[PDB]
């Protein structure tokens, strides 16, 4: 049936994006929020919002019954799952369709068929996708084809994205159209994606991921069965609003676009993670005490956060996404070098300094016919000059002296000058300055090094452990953090249990 009210079963930037697409469609939008998100922007931006009443991602978002109950109470007639969480849970998609809501996404069966790796391998075989021969690869590029697929089986390849900047298996910077490809490689990627999706019976928004070797051989990787995070570069390079296309397809209306849009311009997306690139991109909680977006020519910016937001250890680190676009890849890089220099975020560590570097690094600029970047490039070849985040903390003796910041006019030049409060130049009740100690401690207690949740308990009470044995794995920021026994002894107390939330400094167990 017709979509009328969409429950956006997700959070942050993708929640915002689907709310906005709903409003453009003139649909009603219903948000859901966990307790950490009760103040989040999307709760206000949505036309209505329902509390999931949960402290953690499992009990709040991931339990099907709470989303179906929210849908019931709101009278939402469609569900859009965004990405992650339940957007790939075929059993949830089934439960939605059983409830009779318009599930804005691919069929539960095609989600399963493309989710099973062996089944998907058989699908790619029948489809005669360019599978790799068999072969190990040295330094492949990563290329995605965007699929728009009709319920009537019409399919267009909206374009391609290169996403080779991935740290550990998580894309960080992406570009559209995929540069430095032969038209034969484009032909292959395009028509392979068409074939693959219809052999899967696919419909909705989708994406096929390809892995391209330095020999130039394309290989298929997998189909993600949902709207990508990076879709914005495809929207900024193709005359397409992909979320509205996805609404139309969930309506079952035919594709208005009959043939692959001509890629025009070049568009980069940079993921603004709350991760400190100066400390191996480890994610950390913290307030966003200031947020000031780049604006103006060739800039778009989608954010799940604003000044005064708080980010806690329960959810993914991605704050926002910056998209920068121009007539040519060189022009788009120039505009990127503007926008990332205008971007100021304060209160927590962000990867913005990594973006500033990589958009300035010859390995990524390239020679005009290829670039050097590949899936492991950040992990192994990027010269990490970024100093660790320290924020406003004083850390050296000279920092403890208060300063007064003044604006000085000198021959008409405008200067900003920061003057110490005790400055002697030109000529105390026993005041002393010395280097402040940082806030860092260093028994039997094993204590949680950060706030998070207890995904695994590795021990039973009365178990003998030795130094270095695993005690628990915490999840923080959706990231695994083992905690291990600091000395030998019998595990006792063991106050945690699996699934519990745990605050920093909590005693996990004590070793005697």
């Amino acid at each position: 049936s017709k979509i009328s009210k969409v429950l956006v079963a997700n959070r942050g930037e993708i929640a915002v994006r689907v709310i906005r697409a709903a409003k453009d469609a003139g649909l009603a939008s219903v948000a859901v929020y966990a307790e950490p998100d009760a103040d989040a922007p999307h709760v206000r931006l949505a036309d209505e919002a329902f509390a999931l009443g949960g402290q953690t991602s499992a009990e709040s978002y991931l339990v099907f019954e709470k989303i179906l109950d929210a849908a019931e109470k709101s009278g939402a007639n469609a569900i859009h799952p965004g990405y992650g969480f339940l957007s790939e849970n075929a059993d949830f998609a089934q439960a939605v369709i059983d409830a009779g809501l318009i599930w804005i996404g691919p069929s539960p069966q095609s989600i399963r068929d493309l989710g099973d790796k062996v089944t998907a391998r058989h699908i790619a075989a029948r489809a005669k996708a360019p599978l790799v021969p068999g072969r190990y690869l040295d330094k492949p590029r990563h290329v995605e084809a965007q699929v728009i697929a009709d319920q009537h089986g019409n399919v267009v390849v909206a374009g391609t994205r290169d996403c080779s900047l991935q740290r550990r298996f998580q894309k960080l910077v992406e570009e559209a159209p995929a540069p430095f490809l032969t038209d034969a490689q484009r032909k292959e990627i395009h028509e392979s994606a068409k074939r693959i999706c219809k052999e899967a019976g696919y419909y909705g928004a989708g994406t096929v991921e390809y892995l391209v070797g330095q020999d130039g051989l394309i290989s298929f990787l997998e189909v993600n069965t949902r709207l990508q995070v990076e879709h914005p570069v495809t929207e900024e390079t193709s005359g397409i609003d992909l979320v509205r296309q996805q609404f139309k397809i969930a309506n079952g209306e035919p594709l208005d676009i009959t043939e692959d849009p001509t890629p025009r311009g070049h568009s980069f997306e940079f993921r603004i993670n709350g991760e400190d690139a100066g400390r191996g991109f480890l994610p950390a909680p913290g307030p966003v005490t200031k947020f000031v977006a780049p604006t103006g020519p060739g800039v778009r910016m989608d954010s799940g956060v604003e000044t005064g937001s708080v980010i806690g250890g329960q959810f993914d680190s991605m704050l926002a996404k910056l998209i920068v676009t121009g007539a040519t890849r060189e022009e788009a890089l120039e505009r990127s070098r503007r926008a990332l220099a205008e971007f100021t975020v304060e209160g927590l560590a962000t990867v913005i300094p990594f973006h500033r570097a990589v958009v300035s690094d010859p390995a990524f600029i390239g020679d005009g016919e290829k670039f050097d970047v590949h899936t492991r490039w950040i992990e192994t070849e990027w010269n990490n000059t970024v100093e660790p985040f320290t924020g406003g903390d004083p850390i050296e003796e000279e920092d403890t002296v208060p300063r007064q910041t003044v604006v000085v006019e000198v021959g008409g030049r405008r200067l900003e000058v920061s003057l110490p409060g005790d400055l002697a130049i030109g000529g105390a009740p026993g005041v002393v300055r010395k280097k402040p100690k940082p806030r860092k401690r260093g028994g039997d207690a094993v204590t949680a090094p950060m706030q998070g949740t207890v995904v695994k308990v590795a021990v039973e009470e009365g178990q003998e452990v030795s130094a270095g044995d695993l005690v628990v794995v915490l999840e923080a920021m959706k990231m695994e953090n083992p905690v291990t026994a600091h000395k030998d002894g019998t595990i006792t107390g063991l106050a945690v249990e699996a699934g519990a939330a745990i605050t920093q400094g909590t005693v996990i167990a004590e070793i005697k």
Partner: protein, 62 residues
């Protein structure tokens, strides 16, 4: 070196602007006598603890 130095955070003054700036900034900017100290003028009860914690403390603190 751990003195708090002057910082020019924004822009770049040429040497002559630096010298004008610095010259203008340079331009602008315990004998105990307890006789009749207020604490002596106060009147204390003979058993008043303030004879320790105020009067004597005030006289002795040097």
């Amino acid at each position: 070196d751990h003195e708090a130095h002057i910082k020019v955070l924004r822009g770049e003054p040429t040497p002559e602007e630096m010298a004008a700036l610095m010259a203008v900034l340079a331009s602008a900017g315990k004998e105990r006598n307890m006789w009749g100290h207020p604490v002596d003028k106060l009147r204390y009860s003979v058993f008043s603890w303030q004879r320790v914690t105020l009067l004597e403390r005030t006289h002795m603190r040097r």
